[PDB]
Nucleic acid binder design. Structure first.
Ligand SMILES: [K+]
Ligand SMILES: [K+]
Ligand SMILES: [K+]
Ligand SMILES: [K+]
Ligand SMILES: [K+]
Ligand SMILES: [K+]
Ligand SMILES: [Mg+2]
Ligand SMILES: [Mg+2]
Ligand SMILES: [Mg+2]
Ligand SMILES: [Mg+2]
Ligand SMILES: [Mg+2]
Ligand SMILES: [Mg+2]
Ligand SMILES: [Mg+2]
Ligand SMILES: [Mg+2]
Ligand SMILES: [Mg+2]
Ligand SMILES: [Mg+2]
Ligand SMILES: [Mg+2]
Ligand SMILES: [Mg+2]
Ligand SMILES: [Mg+2]
Ligand SMILES: [Mg+2]
Ligand SMILES: [Mg+2]
Ligand SMILES: [Mg+2]
Ligand SMILES: [Mg+2]
Ligand SMILES: [Mg+2]
Ligand SMILES: [Mg+2]
Ligand SMILES: [Mg+2]
Ligand SMILES: [Mg+2]
Ligand SMILES: [Mg+2]
Ligand SMILES: [Mg+2]
Ligand SMILES: [Mg+2]
Ligand SMILES: [Mg+2]
Ligand SMILES: [Mg+2]
Ligand SMILES: [Mg+2]
Ligand SMILES: [Mg+2]
Ligand SMILES: [Mg+2]
Ligand SMILES: [Mg+2]
Ligand SMILES: [Mg+2]
Ligand SMILES: [Zn+2]
Lengths: 24, 80, 206, 127, 155, 60, 98
RNA sequence: CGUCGUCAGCUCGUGCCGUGAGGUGUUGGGUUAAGUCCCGCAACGAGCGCAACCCCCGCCGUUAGUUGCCAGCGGUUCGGCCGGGCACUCUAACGGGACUGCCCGCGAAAGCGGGAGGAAGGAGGGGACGACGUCUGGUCAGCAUGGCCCUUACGGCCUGGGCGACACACGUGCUACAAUGCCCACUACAAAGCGAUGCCACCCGGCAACGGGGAGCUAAUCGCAAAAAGGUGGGCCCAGUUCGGAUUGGGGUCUGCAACCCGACCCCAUGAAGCCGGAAUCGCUAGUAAUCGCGGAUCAGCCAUGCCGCGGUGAAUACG
């Protein structure tokens, strides 16, 4: 969930971007 | 998962002081207050006394120690 | 241990700001530290004149500084030399080089900043606290005003135990916004300690 | 020719223009069931008509912006009710009871300090 | 509620059966305010009551709610010495509130893997006199009546 | 606000990092707003006196 | 056509001294785009009332910057007369272009 | 500044009663959110407080068009894109309106119940605001200040360490234990804010963090920007798992003189406890609780899951 660094929610919650949450 | 970048850091107090001990020998002991300086090849063999915030600890340096900071061998806290 | 500063609580209405000049996120903190150094040395000088306020306005490298006092003849000096050395402190401080004015106070007994400053001095001279207060209120309440109130802290009379003396007349509806209640806090460094003096004056409503 | 009542809800503004015709409703271009659908709610926005008995007589061009869809769904409930008033005012005498004309004042309450969410207060032990 | 008598809330009738009772049940099924997802569920399950029954879902639903309503329940009350479980009539409104709360509760205790199925089967099983909810209703009713000896604590 | 500490004012901190803000009025280190140069306390006192232009008691 | 923008902390020191730079342009130039509002930039400061602990008190402070537009269509050289240097606002700042 | 406590109170002046402390007034009946108002009364009035005057949010009108619209006509690379126009949305400024006025009933009155009209009633919803006083309450490490004490040091500069210690115990929280769920893809509605060595469009390299290049922006005209939950499709199929992301190994980005002690961040690998929690105990009465994400203050960076704010979705229940 929001705690998984390697997921979408993981990145949203952690406010970051990357492989698992591309900057579009 | 450590990091530094592209320009490894080392304080020049010894960076050159150490290499000078190579220019004419090797010497004995050294005293630093830069536990923040990376360890590089030219240090191996030497024996540097790193400050643990209270004293200067005799830290012998080996090949398998390069890359590590000096502080990593001079523990600051005294426990049980 | 409560109560909003009667002034700050009204800045919106029945009370305008002292420093009323515009600025931007890069100037502001600067054009402010200035006013403080202004009122700073400004207040440690025009003390005897009795300053009930210090306004300030700006447009660009220009600063009003409409100093309100009850004894103008102290900021003027010998015929008019005081106002000279003073406007010299101005430019040597704020290199902005700006004007300066003076506004007499029509009865320094309707300006709490003074009524309080008064009691403070009396106290600093070993006056009789409960009396001074009692009188000051009477003085203020005598020359107009719909109400007034003075409050001195503790150590009243070098007493080892701090207290708080009262006194107040007429109305002083602190909860009413359209009040228009001047407020002034006078310190009072004495031999044994320090005493706070607050003054409230209710000058008409609406 | 045309009719138009605004309508607002929980910070949502809806432009509702009723025009004689079939009854195909548009919303920001998309078809009614195109801007909504998947929202069992939506159907209610067109309740104003059903009440007065419209539907088969008016078409509707609608603009919608601000807040969230269920909110919009309600602002539109007013548009179609306010515009439907300009048409025949004898309709107001039929939407009063239903209350479709009433603007819904219910809004998000301010987040106060000391609290976690305006009212939700932090928990304590006392031991 | 110390001062007033607390009036009851009114709910917008169902966007389908145009029934208020349905919305009530919908809200009990709701969770974290996801009223959409909540509504779906009742509906899908509402369909599943057919093609399993030739009857209308609403009639099924409304009669399940009925068999789960408790007519007596035991409430506490200290009378010097301890607490005596006192039996007593259940108000027309609490009956409904209890009935629905219980259905969603029993429903979610079922093994059926997906929501709509669970509400559906509980709805059905309830309608004919069986199921978690009805069990509860009977344990309660049995509680009261099992304490007839404290009936004189009316209140 | 110890004095030997109001040394802060140093265009020559040696390292931009060590350059910390302080309260223009009290020397207070923590809670020193940037738009005013003042600290959290001073900011409230002055705003009350009306000396902070525009600054008003917000309510909504 | 001269783009005008009036900013300030006072909603009267602008809204008002924004008609002086419109009336003094109604009879000397075009019709002017009248005075245009523009949203405000409210900056809030939330601080703790007491000087030590008691972090659940707070009290709020805002410093809202109001804005105005105007815009005088037709760079009337006859309007530049009444204007130029004739006003009464002290707590204002102007930003204008062509 | 916190606190009982937004509690409905605390007093005064004169008169009257009492040898006196004091009392009456402020008690009583009705009523109210209220010492709110009514009636009564040796009291008649008054101050602090309540309420109101202020801010925000609900509806409407006036004034104003570099933000909105084929509403409406024409052009369209069919994007409000251009002409164009301020009706609409909106922006921000002034003003309107609600008073138990308005109708039936009860009532001595205040006011209570109910309806009509209205966007809204009866304190419409939320703030700012918190009496005389209490707690020898909190802070002399914000600042101020009496006394006291140190004045090659209880002052000062610096490098390094410490405030980050860990057998343990508690508080406040975060993420969970899953199918009303998790994942991937695609697609949709927000508000309030911030932005010059600043937000960073768009482009290229990199799985990515980010790096190189670089348009616009003094910012209703450009950027932070994606809102998320939601909708659609596909997957997982009840398993400690495609639940959950602790811990640890490796590689690397970035800020900064410098990340060992002691930063955040990306990627690979690892993949812990946890199957809804004993006694006990906390919050919340409506757009609230619950749930979802968004901004800011401080700030190089950040240990923020904190704090102060914004809007989306949106309950249950209150006999008493
Ligand atoms: K969750
Ligand atoms: K609490
Ligand atoms: K009474
Ligand atoms: K109100
Ligand atoms: K004390
Ligand atoms: K549980
Ligand atoms: Mg996972
Ligand atoms: Mg995920
Ligand atoms: Mg002495
Ligand atoms: Mg919310
Ligand atoms: Mg000092
Ligand atoms: Mg720093
Ligand atoms: Mg600082
Ligand atoms: Mg407190
Ligand atoms: Mg009250
Ligand atoms: Mg007598
Ligand atoms: Mg008396
Ligand atoms: Mg008396
Ligand atoms: Mg008495
Ligand atoms: Mg009595
Ligand atoms: Mg009263
Ligand atoms: Mg209007
Ligand atoms: Mg009446
Ligand atoms: Mg009668
Ligand atoms: Mg009040
Ligand atoms: Mg103490
Ligand atoms: Mg202490
Ligand atoms: Mg600590
Ligand atoms: Mg905990
Ligand atoms: Mg690429
Ligand atoms: Mg699926
Ligand atoms: Mg797993
Ligand atoms: Mg399981
Ligand atoms: Mg709790
Ligand atoms: Mg930051
Ligand atoms: Mg950490
Ligand atoms: Mg955040
Ligand atoms: Zn300070």
């Amino acid at each position: 969930g929001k705690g998984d660094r390697r997921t979408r929610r993981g990145k949203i919650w952690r406010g970051t971007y990357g492989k698992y949450r591309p900057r579009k | 998962p450590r990091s530094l970048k592209k320009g490894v850091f080392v304080d020049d107090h010894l960076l050159e002081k150490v290499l000078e001990l190579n220019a004419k020998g090797e010497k004995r002991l050294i005293k630093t207050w830069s536990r923040r300086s990376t360890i590089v090849p030219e240090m191996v063999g030497h024996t540097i006394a790193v400050y643990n915030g209270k004293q200067h600890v005799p830290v012998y340096i080996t090949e398998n120690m390069v890359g590590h900071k000096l502080g990593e061998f001079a523990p600051t806290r005294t426990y049980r | 241990g409560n109560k909003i500063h009667p002034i700050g609580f009204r800045l919106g209405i029945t009370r305008d700001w002292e420093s009323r000049w515009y600025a931007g996120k890069k100037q502001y903190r600067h054009l402010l530290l200035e006013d403080q150094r202004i009122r700073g040395l400004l207040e440690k000088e025009l003390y005897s004149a009795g300053l009930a306020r210090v306004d300030i306005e700006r447009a660009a490298d220009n600063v009003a500084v409409t100093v309100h006092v009850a004894k103008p003849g102290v900021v003027i000096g010998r015929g008019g030399e005081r106002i000279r050395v003073l406007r010299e402190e101005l430019a040597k401080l704020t290199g902005k080089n700006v004007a300066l004015n003076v506004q007499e106070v029509q009865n320094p007994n309707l300006s709490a900043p003074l009524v309080a400053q008064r009691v403070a001095e009396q106290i600093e001279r070993r006056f009789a606290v409960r009396r001074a207060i009692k009188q000051a209120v009477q003085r203020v309440m005598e020359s107009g005003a719909k109400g007034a109130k003075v409050i001195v802290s503790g150590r009243i009379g070098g007493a080892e135990q701090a207290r708080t003396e009262w006194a107040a007349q007429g109305r002083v509806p602190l909860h009413t916004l359209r009040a228009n209640i001047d407020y002034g806090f006078a310190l009072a460094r004495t031999t044994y300690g320090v005493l706070g003096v607050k003054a409230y004056i209710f000058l008409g409503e609406v | 020719e045309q009719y138009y009542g605004t309508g607002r809800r929980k910070e949502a503004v809806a432009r509702v223009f009723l025009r004689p015709g079939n009854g195909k409703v548009t919303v920001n271009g998309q078809d009614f069931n195109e801007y909504f659908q998947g929202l069992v709610r939506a159907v209610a926005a067109l309740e104003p008509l059903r009440a007065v008995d419209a539907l088969g007589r008016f078409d509707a061009y609608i603009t919608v912006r601000g807040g969230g869809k269920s909110g919009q769904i309600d602002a539109i409930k007013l548009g179609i009710a306010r515009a439907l008033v300009q048409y025949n005012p004898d309709y107001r005498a039929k939407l009063k009871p239903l209350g479709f004309l009433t603007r819904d004042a219910r809004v998000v309450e301010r987040k106060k300090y000391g609290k976690h969410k305006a009212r939700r207060a932090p928990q304590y032990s006392k031991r | 509620a110390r001062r007033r008598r607390a009036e009851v809330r009114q709910l917008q009738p169902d966007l389908v059966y145009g029934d208020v009772l349905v919305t009530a049940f919908i809200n009990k099924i709701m969770r974290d305010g996801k009223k959409n997802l909540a509504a779906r569920i009742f509906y899908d399950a509402c369909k599943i009551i057919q093609e399993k029954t030739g009857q209308e879902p609403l009639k099924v639903f409304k009669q399940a709610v009925e068999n789960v309503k408790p007519r007596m329940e035991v409430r506490s009350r200290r009378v010097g010495g301890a607490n005596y479980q006192v039996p007593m009539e259940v108000s027309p409104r609490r009956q409904q509130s209890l009935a629905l709360r219980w259905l969603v509760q029993a429903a979610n205790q079922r093994p059926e893997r997906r929501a709509a199925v669970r509400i559906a089967h509980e709805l059905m099983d309830a309608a004919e006199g069986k199921g978690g909810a009805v069990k509860k209703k009977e344990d309660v009713e049995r509680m009261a009546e099992a304490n007839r000896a404290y009936a004189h604590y009316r209140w | 606000a110890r004095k030997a500490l109001i040394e802060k004012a140093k265009r020559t901190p040696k390292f931009k990092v060590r350059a910390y803000t302080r309260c223009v009025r009290c020397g207070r280190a923590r809670s020193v707003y940037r738009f005013f140069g003042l600290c959290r306390i001073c900011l409230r006192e002055l705003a009350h006196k009306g000396q902070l232009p525009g600054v008003r008691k917000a309510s909504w | 056509k001269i783009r005008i923008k009036l900013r300030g902390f006072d909603h009267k020191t602008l809204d008002a001294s924004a008609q002086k730079i419109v009336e003094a342009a109604r009879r000397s130039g075009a019709q002017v785009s009248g005075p245009i509002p523009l949203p405000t930039r409210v900056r809030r400061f939330t601080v703790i009332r007491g000087p030590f602990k008691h972090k659940d008190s707070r009290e709020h402070f805002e410093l809202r910057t109001h804005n105005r537009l105007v815009d005088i269509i037709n760079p009337n050289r006859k309007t530049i007369e009444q204007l130029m240097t004739l006003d009464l606002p002290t707590g204002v700042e102007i930003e204008i272009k062509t």
